[PDB]
Amino acid sequence: EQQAAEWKLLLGQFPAPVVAQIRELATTHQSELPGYFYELRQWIVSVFSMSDDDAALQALIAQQKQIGEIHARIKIPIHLVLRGARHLRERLFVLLRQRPLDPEHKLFGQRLISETVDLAMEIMSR
Amino acid sequence: PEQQAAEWKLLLGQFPAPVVAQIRELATTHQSELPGYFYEQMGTLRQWIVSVFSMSDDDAALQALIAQQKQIGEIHARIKIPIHLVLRGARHLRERLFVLLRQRPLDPEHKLFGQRLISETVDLAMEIMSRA
Ligand code: HEM
Numbered sequence: 468e469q470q471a472a473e474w475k476l477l478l479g480q481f482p483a484p485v486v487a488q489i490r491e492l493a494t495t496h497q498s499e500l501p502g503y504f505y506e507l508r509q510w511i512v513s514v515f516s517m518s519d520d521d522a523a524l525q526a527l528i529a530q531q532k533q534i535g536e537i538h539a540r541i542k543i544p545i546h547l548v549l550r551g552a553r554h555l556r557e558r559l560f561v562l563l564r565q566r567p568l569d570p571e572h573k574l575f576g577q578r579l580i581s582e583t584v585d586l587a588m589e590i591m592s593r
Numbered sequence: 594p595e596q597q598a599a600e601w602k603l604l605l606g607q608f609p610a611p612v613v614a615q616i617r618e619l620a621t622t623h624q625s626e627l628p629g630y631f632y633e634q635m636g637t638l639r640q641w642i643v644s645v646f647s648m649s650d651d652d653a654a655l656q657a658l659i660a661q662q663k664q665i666g667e668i669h670a671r672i673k674i675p676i677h678l679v680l681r682g683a684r685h686l687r688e689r690l691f692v693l694l695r696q697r698p699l700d701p702e703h704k705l706f707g708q709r710l711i712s713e714t715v716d717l718a719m720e721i722m723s724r725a
């Protein structure tokens with residue numbers, strides 16, 4: 468395993484004010500992000516608080532694994548989980564767009580949220 | 594059910610004409626290059642990427658495509674392949690598709706969209722591809 472390194476690998480390829488500005492946009496609009504709209508915050512912050520050390524980070528992978536096995540145990544469609552993902556990436560994209568940060572940093576800021584969430588569901592998918 | 598087409602054609606609406614084509618082209622010119630293995634555990638992925646990157650705009654084609662994704666899922670399900678191996682494939686796909694786009698001299702705003710389009714495209718296919 469040590470999908471922790473793996474995780475750092477994809478994290479170390481992102482500049483600092485992006486990491487900060489993406490983190491800071493998850494921790495703000497933290498509670499404003501839980502979306503239910505069709506016919507929780509600690510999570511976003513957990514994933515988007517991203518650091519270096521592999522105690523304060525590991526619990527993130529072990530937690531993700533936990534929270535899938537929750538979802539599967541009670542038997543809920545994974546494509547429902549991955550859709551939630553989507554609307555999340557989406558709302559996060561929308562939140563990124565409406566900033567006055569250069570499109571260059573947006574460019575990273577986009578891959579940074581997209582990789583994370585998908586990584587999440589990947590490892591959340593057990 | 595059926596409005597899986599509705600959603601896709603709408604999302605495809607959140608994007609400009611060139612980006613769409615740029616991305617279509619991107620996948621298309623490198624369809625033969627992108628089935629790329631570089632790791633450890635255990636011409637098809639061309640027309641898949643192409644099917645799923647034919648920026649298609651027709652409830653008809655969409656349905657079949659949609660349903661294609663569905664059928665692809667079920668096959669992967671019978672053999673009993675872990676969902677998190679496929680999402681992984683999927684992650685590698687857009688990751689290299691990301692990179693391809695980066696190394697193209699486009700307008701970084703054009704670029705942003707280009708990113709969103711490839712991201713949501715695969716993930717949407719992936720979402721549908723789910724049945725097990
Ligand atoms: C991006 C996708 C999702 C994420 C990140 C997520 C996150 C979580 C987390 C972290 C928990 C932990 C609760 C705990 O530890 O006590 C949880 C529980 C739960 N989730 Fe979600 N969820 C997602 C999608 C969904 C969807 C689409 C549904 C639709 C019904 C759903 C329904 C539930 C339910 C019913 C529980 C209760 C489990 C319990 O008893 O603690 N989840 N979810």
Ligand code: HEM
Nearest residue numbers: 634635637638641665668669672674678679680682683686
């Ligand atoms: C994004 C990821 C993937 C996509 C889009 C994909 C797509 C496909 C497609 C289109 C087919 C043939 C269906 C047809 O056109 O008739 C196929 C077959 C197959 N795929 Fe993949 N695949 C993916 C990942 C994987 C992974 C990760 C594995 C295993 C680790 C895998 C194993 C197989 C196997 C074993 C078959 C043949 C099944 C049989 O002969 O019964 N695929 N896949």
